[PDB]
Amino acid sequence: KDTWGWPFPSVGEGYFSGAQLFGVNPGGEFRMNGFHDGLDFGSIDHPGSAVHAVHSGVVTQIGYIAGLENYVVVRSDEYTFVYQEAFSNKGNISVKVGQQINTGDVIGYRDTSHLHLGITRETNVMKAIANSFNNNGTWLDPRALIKNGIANQ
Ligand SMILES: [Zn+2]
């Protein structure tokens, strides 16, 4: 019941650079509006191969949009989770649309320099993605969410 976990559980929370953190941070000025709509887990700072689901849900979408590259969308009762940029091709994704997943289940295998994790209450993922650079409450801080979720389970 509402379990949470980190995507690379041997590292757990670990540490993030200014650029990797959610929101508007020193080091993130290179992005539009200086806003980062997710949390980046680098292969250096958060080592590991298998990307573990941070929360239970159902896989609603697997697609490709340059920038997100290959991505997986998982929807729970309250949240939409986007796992993006980790997978150099769709063959690196382990799950299929319609699949019920539990916290810790492998989404796929990261073979790029990072996973970007995005979390939103928005149900229309494309609309949320249209707000990738807008600090308007669409996207939530995954670090704070996972941390609080783990503490409260
Ligand atoms: Zn990112």
Numbering used by the authors: 360 to 512
Quoted from the paper:
In the present study, we identified and isolated choline-binding protein A (CbpA) as an S-layer protein of L. salivarius REN that we show is important for adhesion. CbpA may represent a new class of surface layer proteins, which contain an N-terminal domain required for cell wall-anchoring through choline binding and an M23 family peptidase C-terminal domain required for the interaction with the ENO1 receptor on the surface of host cells. Here, the results of our in vitro binding and co-immunoprecipitation experiments show that enolase is the CbpA receptor expressed by HT-29 cells.
The structure of CbpA was solved at 1.85 Å resolution. The structure comprises residues 360–512, and residues 338–359 were not visible in the electron density map. The entire structure, which shares key features with those of M23-family peptidases, includes a central six-stranded antiparallel β-sheet (β1, β3, β4, β5, β6 and β8) that forms a “sandwich” structure, two other β-sheets (β2 and β7) are packed against the bottom of the β-sheet and helices α1 and α2 in the C-terminus pack against the top. Zn2+ is coordinated by three adjacent residues (His395, Asp399 of the characteristic HxxxD motif and His475 of the HxH motif) and three water molecules (W110, W111 and W119) in a nearly perfect octa-hedral arrangement. Glu444 and His473 interact with the metal ion through the W111 water molecule. It differs most in the loop 4 of CbpA, forming an α-helix rather than a coil that is present in lysostaphin. These different conformations of the loops in CbpA may indicate binding to more diverse substrates compared with lysostaphin. In the active site of CbpA, the corresponding anionic center that coordinates the lysine residues of ENO1 may include Asp396 and Asp399, and the binding of the cationic to the carboxylate moiety of ENO1 may require Arg390.
